[PDB]
């Protein structure tokens, strides 16, 4: 199923849309996960919030200015911390003639401009804001409470990891970027574009992720020497033309306001914002993720990087392998094509 591992789009009915975990299992039954990324368009009758006009005073405590350095499809992005600002102020800048989206016809045009201009006129990204724009009463696909097994971390050990088991908000402007990465602990992430201009994505199938890694180590050998997991630093940008040149399979997709993107364990992805917009995101899990989390290769070189104890997941969901794993003897080989166990239905 989905042998091309191309990014799939889904249009669930409200009935199917109601149960989050269940629907993720469904799209996995259709091979969605093979692409590393999937889009889900909500029922048109569905909205997370009534009006966004009341958020103008919302504080973005730590905007970052993205200074990209490099050439020929290979870049390293540096972040400059900026003083806090309100959504109102941020929007002013995003729409200012200096930072506004350029003119263009077809996305392919805007895309060529992004890759041409990204090292010029460093933009400001309204990233990693703690919070949610969901109304408290919305029970479908609520990034605040998705009720997946990732909830076990909090339930068991009381541990909160912001952005991972709590929601983040992202206020983008033209040419703001997210570098190539998989999620912390190779989890899933969910991303909802509340409003504004599009967000475009690139994705490498999990079954090809190791090839991207090898390519990246070759391009940035100093960085790979210093840390195995260096891509987790989220500083590495690589153009689609470069992927093509080196024969890394990938697909692209553009996410529009009102649409969800789902990323899947060990799906590498990267992208950029088209212009002023706002997205909400967090991580989540399924039973299938557990083996990924056990095998995730993590950043060594920075302190306090996100690390989740798998012990609770292995004891609960792999009791038969628990002693083996604790002994370092668990040899399980991940098969990226296999759907989550919940898809039996």
């Amino acid at each position: 199923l989905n042998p091309s591992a191309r990014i799939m789009t889904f249009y669930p009915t409200m009935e199917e849309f109601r149960n989050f975990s269940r629907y993720i299992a469904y799209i996995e039954s259709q091979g969605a996960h093979r692409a590393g990324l999937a889009k889900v368009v909500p029922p048109k009758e569905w909205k997370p919030r009534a009006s966004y006009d009341d958020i103008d005073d919302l504080v973005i405590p730590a905007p970052i200015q993205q200074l990209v350095t490099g050439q020929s499809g290979l870049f390293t992005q540096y972040n400059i911390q900026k003083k806090a600002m309100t959504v109102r102020e941020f929007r002013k800048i995003a729409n200012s003639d200096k930072y506004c989206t350029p003119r263009y016809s077809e996305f392919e045009e805007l895309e060529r401009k992004y890759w041409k201009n990204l090292t010029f006129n460093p933009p400001i990204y309204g990233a990693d804001v703690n919070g949610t724009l969901y109304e408290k009463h919305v029970d479908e696909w609520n990034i605040g409470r998705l009720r997946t097994i990732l909830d076990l971390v909090e339930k068991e050990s009381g541990i909160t990891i912001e952005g991972v088991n709590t929601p983040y908000l992202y206020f983008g402007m033209w040419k703001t970027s997210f570098a190539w990465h998989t999620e912390d602990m190779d989890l899933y992430s969910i991303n909802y574009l509340h409003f504004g201009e599009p967000k475009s994505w690139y994705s490498v199938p999990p079954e090809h992720g190791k090839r991207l890694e090898r390519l990246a180590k070759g391009f940035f050998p100093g960085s790979a020497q210093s840390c195995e997991a260096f891509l987790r630093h989220k500083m590495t940008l690589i153009s689609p033309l470069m992927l093509k040149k080196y024969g890394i399979p990938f697909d692209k997709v553009t996410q529009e306001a009102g649409e969800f993107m789902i990323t899947f364990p060990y799906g590498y992805h990267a992208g950029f914002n088209h212009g002023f917009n706002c997205a909400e995101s967090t991580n989540f899990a399924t039973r299938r993720w557990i083996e990924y989390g056990k095998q995730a290769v993590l950043c060594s070189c920075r302190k306090d990087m996100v690390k989740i104890s798998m012990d609770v997941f292995v004891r609960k969901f792999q009791p038969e392998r628990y002693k083996l794993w604790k002994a370092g003897k668990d040899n399980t080989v991940i098969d990226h094509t296999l759907p989550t166990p919940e898809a039996a239905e």
Partner: peptide
Amino acid sequence: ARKSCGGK
């Protein structure tokens, strides 16, 4: 620990 999207 926190999730962070940006390099440095």
